From a paper:
3-deoxy-D-arabino-heptulosonate-7-phosphate synthase (DAHPS) is a key enzyme in the shikimate pathway for the biosynthesis of aromatic compounds. In the seven-step shikimate pathway, the first committed step involves an aldol condensation of PEP and E4P to form DAHP, catalyzed by DAHPS, which can be classified into Type I and Type II enzymes based on their sequence relationships. Plants and microbes use the shikimate pathway as the biosynthetic route to produce aromatic amino acids (AAAs), while animals rely on acquisition of essential AAAs from their foods.
To further investigate the mechanism of the D154N mutation in relieving the inhibition by L-Phe, we determined the crystal structure of Aro3 at 3.3 Å. The Aro3 crystals contain one dimer per asymmetric unit with each monomer exhibiting a canonical (β/α)8 TIM-barrel fold common to other Type Iα DAHPS enzymes. Next, we used the AutoDockTools-1.5.6 program to model the complex structures. During the simulations, L-Phe was harbored in a cavity formed by helices α3 and α4, β-sheets of β6a/β6b and their adjacent loops, and the N-terminus of the second subunit of the dimer. Strikingly, the distance between the carboxyl oxygen (OE1) of Q159 and the nitrogen (N) of L-Phe was centered around 2.8 Å in the wild-type complex, while a much longer distance (centered around 5.3 Å and 5.8 Å) was found in the Aro3D154N mutant complex. Taken together, the hydrogen bonding between L-Phe with the two key residues (Q159 and K222) of Aro3 were weakened by introducing the D154N mutation. Although the D154 of Aro3 and its counterparts of other type Iα DHAPS are located outside the inhibitor binding cavity, substitution by Asn weakened interactions between Q159/K222 and the enzyme inhibitor. The Aro3 crystal structure along with the molecular dynamics simulations analysis suggests that the D154N mutation distant from the inhibitor binding cavity may reduce the binding affinity of L-Phe. Among them, the wild-type enzyme demonstrated high binding affinity for L-Phe with a Kd of 31.4 μM. The mutant Aro3D154N exhibited weaker interactions and higher Kd value, 10-fold of the wild-type Kd.
Numbering used by the authors:
A (entry chain B), B (entry chain A): 1 to 370
Write the structure that this text describes.
Amino acid sequence: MFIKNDHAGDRKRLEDWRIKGYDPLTPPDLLQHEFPISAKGEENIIKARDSVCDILNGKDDRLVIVIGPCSLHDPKAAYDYADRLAKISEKLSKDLLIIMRAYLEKPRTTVGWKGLINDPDMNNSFQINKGLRISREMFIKLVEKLPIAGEMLDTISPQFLSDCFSLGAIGARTTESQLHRELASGLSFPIGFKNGTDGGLQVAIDAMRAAAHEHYFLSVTKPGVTAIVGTEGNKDTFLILRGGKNGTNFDKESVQNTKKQLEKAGLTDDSQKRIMIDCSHGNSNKDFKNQPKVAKCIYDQLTEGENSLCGVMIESNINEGRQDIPKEGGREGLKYGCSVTDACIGWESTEQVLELLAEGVRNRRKALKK
Amino acid sequence: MFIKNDHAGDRKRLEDWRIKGYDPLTPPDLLQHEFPISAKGEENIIKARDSVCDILNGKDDRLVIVIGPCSLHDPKAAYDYADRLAKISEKLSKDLLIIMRAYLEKPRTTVGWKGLINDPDMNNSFQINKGLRISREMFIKLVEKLPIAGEMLDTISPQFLSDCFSLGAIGARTTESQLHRELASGLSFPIGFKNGTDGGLQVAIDAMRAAAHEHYFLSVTKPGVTAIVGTEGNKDTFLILRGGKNGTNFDKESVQNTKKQLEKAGLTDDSQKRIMIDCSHGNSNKDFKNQPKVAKCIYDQLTEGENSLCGVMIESNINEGRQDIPKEGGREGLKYGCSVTDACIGWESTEQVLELLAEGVRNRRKALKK
């Protein structure tokens, strides 16, 4: 702490006796001035957002693919993965609309590395200020290469990193939080809510419904100070089928149920597409090798003409599997292109699945006579 | 809106085209100045906190009863009720500690009054600065009458009102939120989380495990600027049973099952008491009539000497049931002392209930020969 609470632990102060101190923080202004976005990255982002919103509204028959490392921990690897992916995306420019999984943390119940933002040297130093710096810079570099997608959590943290997202996602732990639903209703891109830890759809229905309305809440402004914010709202929201405590909900029947309750909520019609399926995480029962297989199911629903499906989430890294960051050595003790956060499928798995989906969208074209 | 995004709609800019613009805000330093907490309120607040920290470590053999409106919405009415409860609160004082349920906003997914802070004019005018004024004014009056407790909904707001809380809960929906755990660890009083909307008990155990720890995050400081905060961690933590979509857990079995899971967690031992019961919300199935009978169940388990219990929650009001705030009417014409959120028990029932539980505490005393 730069400022230190000299009175920590005294239980005769009304407040703050549990507070160690404070460290200076950088307002989003200064960073947004320091790390601006190039017009090319700007253009990437905007046209990306719109096209997504097109696919949502029934306007485009393409399919959205949010794929990438579950968390990002090493930048050079991010440029490698982004250029390799911009290659294959170049190849599929007319079918998939692929967007990268730029995630800077895995939220956890158990102690660990707290994400790229919190622990920048990965040794629990917590000079988060740097974390942000380098982390935002990586985006002013990536957005020139391809569109990226973050997951929301710290109402405060996006202020620094929202202008780079062309889409966002919301986690199960946080999907019931009216905080976050407000936050989406402010955000400047489409947002996908993950269905509850037990599987529940209702939480995600409720989040979309919430996020569409206009909201007022306390938030943090670009000059690092507090004000009251008004959100026009965000109607271009969707649902991400995910969890396993109740089991896997990727099965076709599950998708139909999602659709029946979505038209039971006025949240979709036959012409709009609001369903994203997330394989990594809950449906894979926590094994990377299970990721390819579900792909099999989604493709198949496309082949029969499933038009509700808007997009698909994929856990993916240059090298497959996962690894434990060493007690000692930090980032230098990690294998190159290998996920710290979740087990990913290897680049090879990833390209074979992409060819499969490129074809599935074509077959949906042929059976619908589209 | 004071400031107005003049670009709200041009989905052509990097960011902020879903933000209406913002409204100025009284910083917490200032609101901690305009309304200070008199020395008597200071005394009540801290004596209560230490009392609850005793009950939590088994040093006290009395019972924490958090009782009050589902939502506090009429400050005259609240003063009247805090009067009454404080009067009988020392009637039973030897028996248990009575903390009043000072909540400001009831979490939802639907349209309606977003609490006293967001819309305290009750007209969807949203004059939030005043909301805060009013509300802190309220608080500093109430801590002179009896200590209080509130529901931590968001993490900017308690900068304005924390020092009136002797004690706080984390709403069922936000328990899984990393954010509310990090916030929890700094607060200078006891926190008890509510179990997940399924009824699941792992969320709350994990939250207790996290909040014990020391965390560093981004938070708002008393002057009104964001900063990096380190917390000591709050070890003064517990669990609240409240119900779910499944498993209403107000029974002897369910409590013992829970105690066993907390023991398996290394959070408590047979001397400590880490379990609080909510008798509204799920357990009551939105039926105020079923609250007293749940008191009865409790009273029975205390007659049996159940020593892991630290408290009970209770949504009580001057007049029972609830009433519908007319959306096309004002708060001008509304029944006095009738909670406008979840259905409450009457004043007479409240006398009754409280007497009955006092008896229960006496009975547990005799069971272990204390």
